Amino acid sequence: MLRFAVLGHPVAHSLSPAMHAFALESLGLEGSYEAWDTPLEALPGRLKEVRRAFRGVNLTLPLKEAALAHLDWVSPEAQRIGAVNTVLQVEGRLFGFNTDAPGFLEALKAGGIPLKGPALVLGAGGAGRAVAFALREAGLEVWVWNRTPQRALALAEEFGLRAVPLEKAREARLLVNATRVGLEDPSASPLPAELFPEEGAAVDLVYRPLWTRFLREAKAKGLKVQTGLPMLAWQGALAFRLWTGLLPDPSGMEEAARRAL
Amino acid sequence: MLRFAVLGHPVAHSLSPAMHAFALESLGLEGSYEAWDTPLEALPGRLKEVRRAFRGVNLTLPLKEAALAHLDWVSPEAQRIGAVNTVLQVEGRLFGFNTDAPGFLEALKAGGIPLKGPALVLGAGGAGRAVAFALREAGLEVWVWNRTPQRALALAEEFGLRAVPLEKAREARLLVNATRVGLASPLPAELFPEEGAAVDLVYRPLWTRFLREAKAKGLKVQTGLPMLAWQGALAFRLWTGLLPDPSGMEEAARRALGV
Ligand SMILES: O=C(O)C1=C[C@@H](O)[C@@H](O)[C@H](O)C1
Ligand SMILES: O=C(O)C1=C[C@@H](O)[C@@H](O)[C@H](O)C1
Description:
Two copies of one chain form a homodimer.
Chain A: E1 2-8, H1 16-26, E2 31-37, H2 43-53, E3 56-59, E4 73-74, H3 76-81, E5 86-90, E6 93-97, H4 100-110, E7 119-122, H5 126-137, E8 142-145, H6 149-159, E9 162-163, E10 174-177, E11 201-204, H7 213-220, E12 224-226, H8 229-244, H9 250-260
Parallel strand pairs in A: 1-2, 1-3, 4-6, 7-8, 7-10, 8-9, 10-11, 11-12
Antiparallel strand pairs in A: 3-5, 5-6
Helix pairs in contact in A: 1-8, 1-9, 4-5, 4-8, 8-9
The complex binds (3R,4S,5R)-3,4,5-trihydroxycyclohex-1-ENE-1-carboxylic acid (2 copies).
Catalytic activity (chain B): shikimate + NADP(+) = 3-dehydroshikimate + NADPH + H(+)
InterPro entries (chain B): Aminoacid_DH-like_N_sf, NAD(P)-bd_dom_sf, SDH_C, Shikimate_DH, Shikimate_DH-bd_N, Shikimate_DH_fam, Shikm_DH/Glu-tRNA_Rdtase
Active site (chain B): 64 (proton acceptor)
């Protein structure tokens, strides 16, 4: 049967096991999807094991960027993004892909979020780079910001976007939190309330808590909002199709993650 | 659903569609595996179609070598062999593999054919190259022969093996006939191995003089059907992560053949 896993640290709280358990039974397939705590230093040995006993694995912090160097092939998109969130194992070879980017666009459509810019992505790490890549592919005007400017500049220069100071958030029509600010901390938000735009939409990739301070601020501000679950479900469904050629129902996977938190 | 196909010219006599229909059915999967005649000229265009509508395809004569130039990635083994018989499509990208080699070895293993050396491979084509590579990596002393001398010497040089005269077949303990281009052996009965095993890479035939001669000589024998089933089951797993029963696939083919 199909052996899958999400590698990272921390991963004991991942909702992927629940989503793909649904995927497997839903498609009538026998298999498992476990959470395997993997610290950066353990990554090399961990991928060696993946080559022998797993059909595929998802990668999460802090392994998405370091993984590229240990793979046999990286997709053109994952190369530009500089992060791989999905690995396929065939004949002991590892192929890297990024389903965070396409998953994000699918989630936006599923949420009725209009593809209207300027779209400001907060955070220029792996997740932020994937979101910026996806919004660029969708043809929107994209702005990027990062606590450390050079990271946002590098991204804007590489993708041909615009790096902006944080206060430009008031002029964005779509705001996406791709930072980890807010993770398990209801008191923290990456953006001061007064910097939110008075109209538009906001999406948060952080889904622990589900209704983060950022999202609650955005909703109260008069912005249309979307939690991080739709993207989580779509990037997962897309990864499952990469591994098997079959697409499990994204909404079903979303529902499964919702019940798992 | 899952869409697969075997591309080649001719492919009207391929037993792959029969075997994979069983693979899909037995594994409770929805999909199809069709034979699609593909002359060498339609190959570039056919692969473009594969990128968009098929999860994977098998390639047979005369596409195994010409296909490499049109793929995004080729496995180390397929590169050395110089032939790709299995293509996987993910996100519109094409990856080439060679399941002929591992399928051959697994078929010998499952069929109880001992890897007794020296082994001799007759024929240096896509199948012959895959077989020689497989036997070499298995640790055997491997000899090669070809109707055309230069062909055998080139293969011997590339893989670090030895090209030998037809008479050396008497000293081989594992004899493989890979001269069956597209379904009479070139080996006189008097030059057959003294002891050991003979494998005839022929898929449709129930029997062959080559095999009857080997059997009579007291050699353990095997046709090419087990290899076809195994290269096919391995291809299916490459495509989906699921391995269909190789024995089941072989039986499906035999029933299709009416023997
Ligand atoms: O929480 C999780 O299990 C995941 C989170 C994201 O990094 C995804 O990109 C990853 O595939 C799995
Ligand atoms: O006849 C067939 O359908 C096949 C023949 C061999 O060349 C195999 O390598 C191919 O994958 C399938």
